[PDB]
Amino acid sequence: AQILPIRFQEHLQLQNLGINPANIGFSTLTMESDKFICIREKVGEQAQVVIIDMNDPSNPIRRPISADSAIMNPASKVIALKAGKTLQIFNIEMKSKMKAHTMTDDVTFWKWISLNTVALVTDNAVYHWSMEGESQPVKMFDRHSSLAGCQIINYRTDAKQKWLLLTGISAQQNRVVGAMQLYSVDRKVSQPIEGHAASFAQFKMEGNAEESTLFCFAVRGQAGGKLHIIEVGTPPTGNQPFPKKAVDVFFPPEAQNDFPVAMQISEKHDVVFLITKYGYIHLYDLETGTCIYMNRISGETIFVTAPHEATAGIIGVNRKGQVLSVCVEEENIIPYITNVLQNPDLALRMAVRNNLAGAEELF
């Protein structure tokens, strides 16, 4: 068989839209959802910000805007801008300031965690800040000492905002070591975890009426590459617990310095997408951890990812400016699982879930 369980797509080449490759990187380019990319560029002496609307990519909007960091809202024409310790949320459509706040501590990382809330990470704490109303940032938890001095690379929550996860990395010798802090809002407890990339997911087990809240993380530490899928906290009333899964994360012999950097989980397909530093993608079944597919999909590091809503896939930007995505190929995944993976248990479970499109309708 020459069929794949995935479809790879190239959506854009940012260098073809007038972006300097020097600005295609984590400190200057943000992609908080699949709807926009925002780039900060200094051209001559002038600070400029560029917004690429992914529905209208050939018409980037570029303006002289001074900001140390810029993150578009996941859905609205709303942008958060930082300069020093002062933060602003700005309504672009209405050319009007929504909210502003001056922090005491420097915000070293920030990210939209929902359609209306931005998370703020300082050296010692994490806050949530609504874009609505008058409310100021609210401290969610204090940072755990295991993340001290890390470079923060991600912050994310489960859908219900009851489980909060901060992820950093640090250099030790010639290694890149991942440190995570998982915080339970209900329990007011943190747990340190050695991890490089992670995501949450909602999964409805066979036999259960209510979805389980799953936490998936991957790491490459002293025991090698490992992926874990675990239910966090107490199951919903009436549910059976999700049995913890643990599987190997493979790296080939020529990739001893590769490690996980990003994860997204398909809401529709119950598949984990894992991206590595060297530009590999792995697919894993969320229920079992079974590895479905691995391949190198990018010749450059992919430094930012988001869910790709249209395909329930993953979209990312690599360092040369290729905007790429991977999703399940809904017609070919079960054939691939049947004849290449030769995993009929998975083939059957996937068909029973019945979340793969088949046979086009008339409207």
Residues that bind ligand A1ATQ (CB under 6 A): 49, 51, 61, 63, 65, 79, 90, 92, 95
> Three-state SS across 126-154?
EEEEECCCCCCCEEEEECCHHHCCCEEEE
Q: Which is nearer to ligand A1ATQ, 43 or 61 (CB)?
A: 61
What are residue 155's DSSP bridge partners? 166
Quote the least distance from Cβ 12 to ligand A1ATQ, whole Å.
17
Quote the least distance from Cβ 83 to ligand A1ATQ, whole Å.
10
Measured CA distances, 161 to 40, 90, 113, 332 (Å): 30, 24, 9, 35
Measured in whole angstroms, the distance separating CA 351 from the mean position of its chain's CA atoms is 27
Measured CA distances, 238 to 7, 200, 214, 241, 273 (Å): 38, 21, 17, 10, 30
Quote the least distance from Cβ 138 to ligand A1ATQ, whole Å.
25
Q: Which is nearer to ligand A1ATQ, 78 or 193 (CB)?
A: 78
Quote the least distance from Cβ 260 to ligand A1ATQ, whole Å.
32
Say if residues 210 and 197 touch (Cβ distance below 8 Å): no
Question: 3-class DSSP state for residue 339?
Answer: helix
Quote the least distance from Cβ 100 to ligand A1ATQ, whole Å.
12
Which token pair is 37?
């990319």
Q: Which is nearer to ligand A1ATQ, 19 or 51 (CB)?
A: 51
Q: Which is nearer to ligand A1ATQ, 63 or 175 (CB)?
A: 63
Q: Which is nearer to ligand A1ATQ, 15 or 66 (CB)?
A: 66
> Three-state SS across 4-63?
CCEEEEEEEEHHHHCCCHHHCCCCCEEEEECCEEEEEEEECCEEEEEEEECCCCCCCEEE
Quote the least distance from Cβ 4 to ligand A1ATQ, whole Å.
37
Q: Which is nearer to ligand A1ATQ, 30 or 301 (CB)?
A: 30
CB atoms within 10 A of CB 360: 6
